[PDB]
Amino acid sequence: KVFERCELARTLKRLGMDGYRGISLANWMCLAKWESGYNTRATNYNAGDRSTDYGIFQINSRYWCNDGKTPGAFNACHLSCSALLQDNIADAVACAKRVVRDPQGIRAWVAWRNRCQNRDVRQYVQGCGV
């Protein structure tokens, strides 16, 4: 599914993402925007290290989900990477929360540092009623 901006903002809020571990909804929106264009079936194989990024937040298989084909990987979210390719983002949200419980927080995603960190992200949630 390709979410529309405000539709996604409310979906995330409903799933408890607003201010989760101090991360505003606008930040999560900026992440999803740059990671996948709000696309849940988005995928990216990393030929360099044999891992694959999955879903709306482009979560990596080396440490977060199991796809069975990434060498010496871990499954911190205890989910099949397939769960991150669903139209329903509940599982992706649970995993995204798992990611930020670690030291780096929202900084785990380099795209966030590149396109959201120290930026004006107010625009991502404006007019959405969140």
Structural domains in the chain, CATH included, are: 1-130 (1.10.530.10)
Task: Tell me, in Å, the resolution of the deposited structure.
Answer: 1.8
Enzyme catalytic residues: 35, 53
Place of tokens 């959405």: 128
Is residue 38 within 8 Å of residue 3, measured between CB atoms? Answer: yes
Q: Which two tokens stand for residue 48?
A: 């360099």
Structure tokens at 35: 């990671």
Structure tokens belonging to residue 125 = 């949630």
Q: List CB contacts of 8: < 8 A, sequence separation 6 or more.
A: 29, 32, 38
CA 89 – CA 91 distance, rounded (Å)? 6
